[PDB]
Every structure is written in structure tokens, then in C-alpha cells.
Design a protein around this ligand. Structure first.
Ligand SMILES: Cc1ncc(COP(=O)(O)O)c(CN[C@@H](Cc2c[nH]c3ccccc23)C(=O)O)c1O
Ligand SMILES: Cc1ncc(COP(=O)(O)O)c(CN[C@@H](Cc2c[nH]c3ccccc23)C(=O)O)c1O
Lengths: 382, 382
């Protein structure tokens, strides 16, 4: 006959793509609002990366690359993972995907079989459930109270494990909470993964925007269970470039590569080479990051002081560039609250799809002047 | 527990990807062969496309693009479809995927539900079945005789339709045969699609590398059923860039866009703006194609002459850059035949996965002095 699939019909739109369009036609019509929806860093990607891309175009590095990505990058990848993380992977247990998304997607398609349960920790990033389910998974979620600073309690994460449980998904530095879990909790969870025998999917990516704490990887602890997902996007201001990467069990990272070969065929060649440089040129990249962090950090202190001065309540993030604000007095729920704020010319993303009810996700990853302006517009609404 | 899925385990490796690696350690050890495994044009991509890319880097066009691709490209896309094809789509009924592969993938994930049958005509391009099945489809295949020069006979394609039947997939100018189906057969096939009610998936792509015939699109005929898939790769020597596109029913084109948002998030920004230029700068592109065409046409004739002279049998392609050679006198089957040829230092791809048994796929998309040598090496094998 004709008609769409159950899976596609069944899937929810987007918390953030929504607020974006509904800016532009408010913003497209005179009304200038301030937009704190941001997932991307205001900074432009580094000149040596841009450079390297140019070098590739020139050399004619424009043909089909391997499904798992170019050797040079995989090789350089297995190295960042050791140097920076203590993971001890070889280039065969490394893969470069079309962004950290394609990694998370191709992962769940390789493990997840229908009815398999994936434990997920709320407040959580919008897409985990969508993609768990798209594969035929079953989201089994565990809350993380704000009083206990949004860091998982091992004991209860334990009492969510069932014989159908196939994966646990931990993300530190946290989006949308900004929390950064201590070593011995990643230690703890990594252990339940080994104990009950199921993968542990760690979405590291925000590792470098770390203001206060120490970033621990569980793949140091449970290497034959852990799947460590990272990407170029957030650290190197390379979101539009579309490059992410991962490492773990040789076998699953080839199930992944074969989905990749039939879905995208292989990431855009130019960008691979461009990434190779951000990775191999320590000294240059070491500085961009260094500049970006302290940068976001001052905005992080700006938002929070003005926010707290205003009366609004929020959890001081230690990493990433998000802040879940308590819309409690600005409205009675997080949706009418959201509109009230769009009315004060400031686009926020409702905590609804993150299971962060009665909260809205602020983003200081934009300008110093938008946090000053957005904080002024909040001020009047109150 | 732990282990891979029944979908990933179940998939077969790659016919072409195999021959490639197995060159390189034969190649990568003294032995130079002649590799007619080629899917890519030996020409490098046009300089105005390269420059447009540079122009984007410069302009800092490096942030997240929308899931369906940038507006400018969508609008420019909808035009190429009208102008060059007669399909009257609006940019909303247009989408830019991460290659023609991702389009074909995201498509079947949007229509195809488990047990749904997809008619596919053999000889056929390796990946169609692979990805019909990955989604939960059921390949139902129809043979096309070489005596009838590999063009489908609508009547028998008719008697393969069952109430399970959800899509038909035609690709002219054909994948490994090189055939280009007549106006009234695409007309015929497009008709059944409407009559019996089921989508028609047209994999046009090779439209521009046509030597003798006229490229007809069925979306002219059955616009509410057809899903027209094309891409930058083959025409503009842009394989490595990773960019493809499609058009059709506004509904399945955003079911598609919705998968895209969670699989790739969106194609590589730089390559979008690079493509926009190839699409809008007519005069420049109009010439590269013109050059490439006649180029491939001559190699197409060199190969055919020398092959015909040598005694070997083959079907005179009218489009694309493949030729399905009859390994009949080179060995008793198409796989031992394949090896006897790697012996004479010439890598071919066995017709086995294309359901082109007793045939082997040569590809004149390489040099005029590779056809010369490869033809020489065939000669010696006798
Ligand atoms: C925790 C997390 N994991 C992965 C990704 C995607 O990484 P990839 O390497 O695939 O690109 C993210 C990404 N992004 C944002 C999205 C977002 C928020 N506001 C936006 C405005 C415009 C465009 C995109 C926006 C997010 O965190 O919501 C994250 O965070
Ligand atoms: C008929 C047809 N449709 C789609 C594609 C894929 O196009 P996309 O825009 O996704 O890149 C193919 C093209 N080419 C090849 C497959 C092939 C050979 N060697 C390759 C290396 C890398 C990627 C793809 C390769 C083929 O016929 O062998 C086809 O043909």
C-alpha cells in the first residue's frame, strides 16, 4: 500500500528545533528576541583546522574514504583516547562517525534488539530516548534529584536493572544539568555494567569545557563493556562540520562501521583531514580550548549572579554550557513559563523533553551581551 | 546481556569494499594491478565548487545546519528538479541527505515496516537489498534478461506485486548494467505504482552520464507516489564530499528529515554551500559535465572494442560507467574467474552480489591508459 512506518510516525518532534523556527518569524518580523537555546559555541572553529581543510581541497583529498573513517584519523584517534583519557584502544577499536549523533545512533542499532531495555538518567538530553526507541529499545529511566546536585545514586540505578537491561547511558559533563559526576560514581556505575553484564555507553564530548572537577572515563574501569562516545563539535567549535568518534569492543565497533557503510557510506573526507589536525596539532588546539573555557566560565558566572540576584533558582553547572533554571515563580509550569519569556524577547528551551519539569534550559554559550540583555528581559517579567 | 543485534549480524559484507582492501597488500607489496573496481570518476571535483567551499570556510559557515539541509540549497534543489526534470516540487518537498546512500537509507526507514515487500530488479546494485532488509523489508526480485538488453518488462514486474508490496525500485541508467530504460517503461512502471498503490523509488543519480538515449523521470507521471533520489557525487566528481538529495510527497520527505535529525543531525555545512554553487552556477557546471560525458564515452568505446575483439562478451552500456562482462570463457563461474583475473593484475568486482552470476563488473571510469593495460592483461590470460 502506501503510508509511513510505525517507528517514524511514533517519534516525537524536537524541543529545540521548535523554539528555533518559532524565533525566526517573531525575529523574522521586527521582533528581536535574545535566543538562549544554543547548543553551539559562539566562537568560530580554529584557523589551523580551517587551514587543514583548505590543504585537503588543494591536494584533491575528495574521494570516498573508508566506512570507519580514514586510517590517519583513526590512528590519531586511538591516541587522543590514551593521551587524554587512559583508554587503551588500538586504531581498530576506534571509529569516526558523522558526528557524535551518528555514533550514538549506529551504536543502538548494533546492540539493541526489540524489547531490550536501556537505562537512561533524568534530567536527560532530548535525543537518547528517541534513538533508543527508534532501534526498538525500551527507555527505563532513573531520576537524579536536584538537591543531590544531579549526580546519580548508584544504589537506585542498580534497582532498575532487569534481565532485559542491555545498556546504561551516562553523560558527564551533563546536558542539560551541567553536572560533572565524581570519579567513584562513574567508577560505581561502570561496575554495575560489568557485574550484571551489559554495555555502558559514556557520552563524553563535553569533557573539555570543565570549569571545576576532574573528568574521569569509565572505560579505564570496564574496557570490555564501555563504549566511549566523543566528538569534535563542542570542544573545537566544529558543530557544522559533522564529525564525531568512538572507541570500545573491537566487535561492536565494526557492527557500527558496517551500519555506517550502508547508511552514510563514510563521513565527509575533507572534514576528517581537518579534524586530524585539531587532534595532532596539540599546541594550537590546546590554546583554543584554553581560551574557550575561561570564556564560557565568566558567562557562567555572569548568568548565575544575575539569575540569583533576580531571585530565580538554578544549579551551578561545573561543565558544559547549560543551566536548568527554575521557572517556578515565572509561571506555574514550564510551558506557559516558556511563552511568558518568549514574550519578553528571550527564547529558552522547556525542560519538558529532558524530564526536567518546572525548569527551562538556559544557554550561556552565546555572547556576553546576550546574557546581559536576556538577564534584563528576565528582570522586567518578574 | 552483551552481543550484537539480529539485524547487524544478519548483514552480508561488501563486494566492492572487499576487492579494494585485497588489492592493497598485493598492491601494497610489489604487485601493481589494474583496478576497474571504480565507483568514482577519475576526474577531481570542479574548481568553482572547491572555491565555493573555501568561500564558506572564510565566511565562517561552520555551525549546525537544519536537518533537511540549508534553505538556499533546498530552494536551489527544487529548481534543478523542475528545470532539469519536469518534477514540480516545492523546496519543502525537497531534502539534502548525507549522500544518495543516506537518502535511500532514511527513505526505507520511513516507509518500510517489518514484512513489507520491496520489489527490486536484477541485475541490481549491491546495497538495495542490504538496506531494504536492514529496515525490516523483504526483497522480492525480478530478473531482467540480457537478451532483452536488461530493460524491465512491466508485465512480469506486475506479477510480483502482492498486497504486502510497498515499494518498487528502478534505477536507470542502471547500476551494474549501464542500461537506460525507455520513456514508456518508466511510464509503465510508474503506472503500476499508482494503480496498485505503493511508492516508486527512482534512483536517478547517473542521469548526466548518458551517452545515447533520453533520461525520463517517472515523478513527472506519478508525483504522489514517486520518490526521486539523486546526488552530487557522480555528475560533479563529488563522491568524497558526501552529499545527496531527494524529492517527493511532502510527508515522507520529512519523516526522512526526522530520521536525519537523529542519525546525522544534518549534512556537513561546508559541502552544502559547495553544492549550492554547482547547482546554481549553470555555465560552469554545464561544461564539466560536457567534458566528463564524452570523456567516459570514449573509454566506453575503447573498452568495448578491445573487449569485443578479444572475444569476450558484453552489453553496450548507454549510461553510467559500468559494463557487465561475460566471464564465460575466462572460467566456469564468476568467482574463480575473478581470481584468475586478479592474477593478471586486474581487479574486477564479481557479479555475484548483483545477481549477475557468470558476469563481472568492469568500470571504465578510470584512465584511458588503464583500459589499455587492463585490456592487454585480459588478452594474455586468453
Ligand atoms: C550531550 C550531547 N551529545 C551530542 C550532541 C550532538 O553532538 P554531534 O557531534 O552529533 O554534533 C549534543 C548537541 N547539540 C545541542 C543542540 C542545540 C541547542 N540549541 C541549538 C540552537 C541551534 C542549533 C542547535 C542547537 C543541544 O545540546 O541541545 C549534545 O548536547
Ligand atoms: C546506483 C548508485 N546509487 C547510489 C550510490 C551511492 O551514492 P552516494 O551519493 O551515497 O555516494 C552508488 C555509487 N558507487 C559505487 C559504490 C562504490 C564503489 N567504490 C566506492 C567507494 C566508496 C563509496 C562508494 C563506492 C559502485 O557501483 O561500486 C550507486 O552506483
Amino acid at each position: 500500500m502506501r503510508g509511513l512506518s510505525r517507528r517514524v510516525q511514533a517519534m516525537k518532534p524536537d524541543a529545540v528545533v521548535a523554539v528555533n523556527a518559532k524565533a525566526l518569524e517573531l525575529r523574522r518580523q521586527g521582533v528581536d528576541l535574545v535566543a538562549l537555546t544554543a547548543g553551539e559555541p559562539d566562537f568560530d572553529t580554529p584557523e589551523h583546522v580551517k587551514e587543514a581543510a583548505r590543504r585537503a581541497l588543494a591536494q584533491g583529498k575528495t574521494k570516498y574514504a573508508p566506512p570507519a573513517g580514514i586510517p590517519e584519523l583513526r590512528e590519531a584517534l586511538a591516541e587522543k583516547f590514551r593521551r587524554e583519557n587512559g583508554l587503551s584502544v588500538t586504531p581498530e577499536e576506534t571509529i569516526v562517525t558523522v558526528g557524535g549523533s551518528q555514533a550514538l545512533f549506529n551504536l543502538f542499532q548494533a546492540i539493541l534488539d526489540p524489547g531490550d531495555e536501556v537505562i537512561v538518567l533524568s534530567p536527560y538530553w532530548v535525543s537518547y530516548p528517541e534513538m533508543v526507541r527508534f532501534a526498538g529499545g525500551v527507555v527505563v529511566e532513573v531520576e537524579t534529584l536536584p538537591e543531590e546536585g544531579f549526580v546519580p545514586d548508584p544504589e537506585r540505578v542498580r534497582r532498575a536493572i532487569t534481565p532485559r537491561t542491555k545498556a546504561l547511558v551516562v553523560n558527564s559533563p551533563n546536558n542539560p544539568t551541567g553536572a560533572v559526576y565524581p570519579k567513584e560514581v562513574l567508577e560505581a556505575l561502570a561496575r554495575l555494567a560489568v557485574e550484571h553484564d551489559f554495555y555502558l555507553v559514556s557520552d563524553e564530548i563535553y569533557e573539555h569545557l570543565l570549569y571545576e572537577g576532574e573528568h574521569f572515563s569509565p572505560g579505564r574501569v570496564a574496557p570490555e563493556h564501555t563504549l566511549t562516545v566523543n566528538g569534535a563539535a563542542k570542544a573545537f567549535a566544529m558543530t557544522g562540520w559533522r564529525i564525531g568518534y568512538a572507541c570500545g569492543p573491537k566487535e561492536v565497533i565494526k557492527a557500527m562501521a558496517s551500519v555506517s557503510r550502508q547508511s552514510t557510506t563514510s563521513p565527509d573526507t575533507i572534514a576528517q583531514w581537518a579534524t586530524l589536525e585539531a587532534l595532532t596539532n596539540q599546541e594550537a588546539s590546546r590554546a583554543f580550548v584554553e581560551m574557550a573555557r575561561e570564556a564560557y566560565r565568566r558567562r557562567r558566572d555572569l548568568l548565575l549572579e544575575g539569575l540569583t540576584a533576580l531571585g530565580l533558582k538554578a544549579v551551578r553547572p561545573s561543565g558544559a554550557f547549560y543551566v536548568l533554571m527554575d521557572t517556578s515563580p515565572i509561571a506555574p509550569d514550564e510551558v506557559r513559563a516558556a511563552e511568558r519569556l518568549l514574550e519578553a524577547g528571550v527564547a529558552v528551551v522547556p525542560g519538558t523533553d529532558f524530564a526536567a519539569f518546572g525548569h527551562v534550559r538556559l544557554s550561556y554559550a552565546t555572547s556576553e551581551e546576550n546574557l546581559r540583555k536576556a538577564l534584563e528581559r528576565f528582570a522586567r517579567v518578574l
